[PDB]
């Protein structure tokens, strides 16, 4: 039937299994029939270009609709009180009441309010007109076309890169760090200085006049001279109104270090100063390696080193890394598993900052965008983190060569993996028995009308971190809260210019910068501890046990994703390392759930000016049940009541939608195949023995979904329901109250 074109085994399949499994392994080039290592890398390289194009085309969409169907110019004049528009609705199913409800934000038709926060990005970036967005949209289309042509080009025969070009790792670090990180960071300081910072001060700078008008009054002569202090002479005053010249200054680079008073965001002058310094280090960082000129460090030589100054050490930190370089470079799953974890951490790193240190103007007061953006990135951090171990497990199956490693660090981990998996189980058990029973003790004892008997304990040493940053509320008078301490007033160089601005922000109380933590904040971090240790326990186990176990020593021969080894020797329901991945997402989704509930309820108390309800009721779990879930769901469920319809009608429909998607998955998890195959065999009998429908007959024989497939179909249902129904609650609860 020749549909797959990568596996003859699937094509020689009379059943419906071929259609599903074809969808599964179509991106799995390593499993494709007759795929050499050269063609593998070459096909992967071209695919990246098509992926990058999808990103820029998606970015072009945000600018086109906001320009064509949006209120950007209107929102700029009153950002706090005007609601941004994402795009326009056109649904023939709507009735007159629905259109009258969704006609909002001053639009002339049914329209969708925005919650991505691009309006606050595009205001801070230097854009002030719909036409400027249109140019960016058209530019990205051509910018995407540039990559799509490159992908086609690099598959042509004489332009196809060679295998050695891909494995030239020491060069790639040299260019990415210096060029992709550095120059892109250096360039961004240019736009901030030439476009954004002037536009914040009132002057209109564009392609027409950026060559003529200068950012600073003095030219570039102080830089080439070296008297760099000139650029930080006149900073923007505190009473500076954004996008105007009142209270403005001439400084392009400075280290004021605090928050802008009006926008309650970071100073753009610092962001320009910021990226410039980082680009210098990244460029400096780039020149480390051994690329063809000969001047630099060889990572392979550093890894295989066995000698310090005089002592014959086993390696770096006298640890044997004798075969880590070839391991990293030769196997792609090792790289992908590594790069995903690095990116997964950075994704959470973004989220942890953007609410505490908002960079974009007036985004802090848009309470809905601040919540959706946090919940967005953290969910993404999970998959990037959870996907990392999945590829680390795939590496140990189909790419790990024990003969090449032979006593390095990596083999040393597999030797004592029992201690790694065992001690993780103790930590996960040690946390949950104690974390839970404190919630249950407080919940019961509060239910018995004696809240004073609760086990409330203060996050002491965490407050020492906030007191270490200059928070006076706790009164510890530690580093940077004591004015006499050496860190507050640096003895050699009294150059802590960040101090007057930082202390004003952290000690304000209005912003979300290092908010107050109480006993309720304590227990939840240990719940978060339990999630992250246990997710690791599952994933670490499957990876290390992917190659073998006492139950199934020959697991590597079968592969990463196999269903089972049958019922023999006690039962082998879930042995594959794919199953460890499979059980982990059920946790990892819950971990951010525990986080996002903690982020949301803590902030709703602050935005509404009611901090006591969280600090008091967060201890007992009925508080999370009553004060957060029950109370905040009132406006959502009333989105479409029998007394009319309001703006929050999609969310209620989406709320019940994700509930249904969450549940239909459970069928594929609970109910397994053998029941369904027998059921389908009866339908085959009837269709073959019914009078008139006997004319029509399947070409591919219908069969029940495979065991691994139903696990795939079931978890997506678990996840899609999990994601959607909380987004509706997160947005509707926040939007209806507006904090």
């Amino acid at each position: 039937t020749k549909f797959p074109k990568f596996s003859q085994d699937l094509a020689q399949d009379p059943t419906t299994r071929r259609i599903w499994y074809a969808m599964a392994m179509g991106n799995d080039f390593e499993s494709h029939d007759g795929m050499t290592e050269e063609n593998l890398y070459q096909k992967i390289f071209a695919t990246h270009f098509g992926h990058l194009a999808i990103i820029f085309l998606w970015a072009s969409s945000l600018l086109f609709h906001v320009a064509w169907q949006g209120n950007f110019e209107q929102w700029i004049k009153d950002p706090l009180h005007v609601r941004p528009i994402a795009h326009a609705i056109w649904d023939p199913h709507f009735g007159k009441p629905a259109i009258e409800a969704f006609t909002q934000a001053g639009a002339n038709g049914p329209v969708n309010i925005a919650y991505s926060g691009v309006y606050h990005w595009w205001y801070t970036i230097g854009m002030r007109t719909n036409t400027e967005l249109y140019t960016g949209s058209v530019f990205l289309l051509l910018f995407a076309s540039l990559f799509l042509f490159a992908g086609w080009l690099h598959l042509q025969p004489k332009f196809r890169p060679s295998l050695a070009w891909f494995k030239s790792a020491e060069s790639r670090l040299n260019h990415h760090l210096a060029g992709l990180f550095g120059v892109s960071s250096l360039a961004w300081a240019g736009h901030l200085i030439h476009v954004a910072i002037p536009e914040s001060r009132g002057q209109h700078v564009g392609w027409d006049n950026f060559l003529s008008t200068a950012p600073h009054p003095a030219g570039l002569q102080p830089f080439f001279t070296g008297n760099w202090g000139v650029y930080a002479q006149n900073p923007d005053t505190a009473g500076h109104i954004f996008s105007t010249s009142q209270g403005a200054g001439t400084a392009i680079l400075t280290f004021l270090g605090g928050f802008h008073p009006q926008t309650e965001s970071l100073w753009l002058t610092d962001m320009a100063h910021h990226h410039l310094a980082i680009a210098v280090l990244f460029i400096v960082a780039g020149h480390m390696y051994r690329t063809n000129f000969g001047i630099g460090h060889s990572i392979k030589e550093m890894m295989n080193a066995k000698t310090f100054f005089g002592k014959p050490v086993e390696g770096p930190f006298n640890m044997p890394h004798q075969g880590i370089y070839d391991t990293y470079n030769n196997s792609l799953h090792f790289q992908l598993g590594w790069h995903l974890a690095c990116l997964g951490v950075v994704t959470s790193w973004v989220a942890q900052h953007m609410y505490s240190l908002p960079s974009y103007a007036f985004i802090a007061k848009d309470y809905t965008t601040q919540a959706a953006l946090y919940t967005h990135h953290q969910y993404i951090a999970i998959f990037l983190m959870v996907g990392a171990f999945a590829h680390g497990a795939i590496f140990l199956v189909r790419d790990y060569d024990p003969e090449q490693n032979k006593g390095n660090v990596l083999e040393r981990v597999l030797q004592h993996k029992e201690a790694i998996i065992s001690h993780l189980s103790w930590v996960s058990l040690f946390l949950g028995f104690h974390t839970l029973g404190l919630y249950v003790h407080n919940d019961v004892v509060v239910a018995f009308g004696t809240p004073e008997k609760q086990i409330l304990i203060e996050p002491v040493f965490a407050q020492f971190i906030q007191a270490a940053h200059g928070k006076v509320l706790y009164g510890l008078d530690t580093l940077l809260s004591n004015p006499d301490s050496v860190a507050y007033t640096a003895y050699p160089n009294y150059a802590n210019v960040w101090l007057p601005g930082w202390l004003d922000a952290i000690n304000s109380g209005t912003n979300s910068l290092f908010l107050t933590i109480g006993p309720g904040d304590f227990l939840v971090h240990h719940a978060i501890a339990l999630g992250l240790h246990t997710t690791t326990l599952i994933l670490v186990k499957g990876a290390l046990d992917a190659r073998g176990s006492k139950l199934m020593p020959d697991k590597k021969d079968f592969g990463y994703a196999f269903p089972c080894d049958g019922p023999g020797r006690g039962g082998t329901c879930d042995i594959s390392a794919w199953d460890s991945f499979y059980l982990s997402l059920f946790w990892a989704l819950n971990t951010v759930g525990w986080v996002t509930f903690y982020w949301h309820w803590k902030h709703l108390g602050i935005w509404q000016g009611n901090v006591a309800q969280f600090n008091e009721n967060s201890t007992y779990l009925m508080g999370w049940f009553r004060d957060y879930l029950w109370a905040n769901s009132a406006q959502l469920i009333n989105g479409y009541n029998p007394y009319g319809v309001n703006n929050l009608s999609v969310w209620a429909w989406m709320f019940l939608f994700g509930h249904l998607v969450w549940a239909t998955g459970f069928m594929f998890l609970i109910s397994w195949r053998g029941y369904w195959q027998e059921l389908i065999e009866t339908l085959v009998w009837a269709h073959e023995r019914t009078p008139i429908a006997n004319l029509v007959r399947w070409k591919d024989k219908p069969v029940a979904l495979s065991i691994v497939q139903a696990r795939v179909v079931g978890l997506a249902h678990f996840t899609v329901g999990y994601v959607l129904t909380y987004a509706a609650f997160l947005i509707a609860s926040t939007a209806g109250k507006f904090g």
Partner: protein, 102 residues
């Protein structure tokens, strides 16, 4: 037979059933459904359909549906007759008051 059958649900129960253009919506909606029904035949015909089965009630081989030609000719006639049945049902129901008014 099917165009005459499919006109009813769209008209008396679809949107605009309580309007002046109710019966017209049934005719257009039915034709759009007949076209999809016609398209389905062409795909099942142009995909090398295996065979037609013979059961007890139809003991002999049923018909010459054993090839692409038999199903393709079936599809062309479905659109012709299918649209005809709906157009018939429209003129009767729209002018049923007149036919009784005679």
């Amino acid at each position: 037979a099917h165009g005459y059958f499919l006109f009813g649900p769209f008209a008396k129960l679809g949107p605009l059933r309580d309007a002046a253009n109710a019966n017209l919506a049934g005719l257009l909606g039915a034709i759009g459904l007949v076209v999809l029904f016609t398209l389905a035949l062409s795909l099942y015909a142009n995909s090398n359909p295996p065979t037609a089965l013979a059961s007890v009630t139809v003991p002999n081989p049923p018909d010459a549906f054993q090839s692409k030609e038999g199903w393709n000719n079936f599809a062309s006639a479905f659109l012709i007759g299918g649209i005809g049945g709906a157009v018939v049902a429209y003129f009767l129901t729209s002018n049923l008051a007149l036919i009784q008014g005679l």
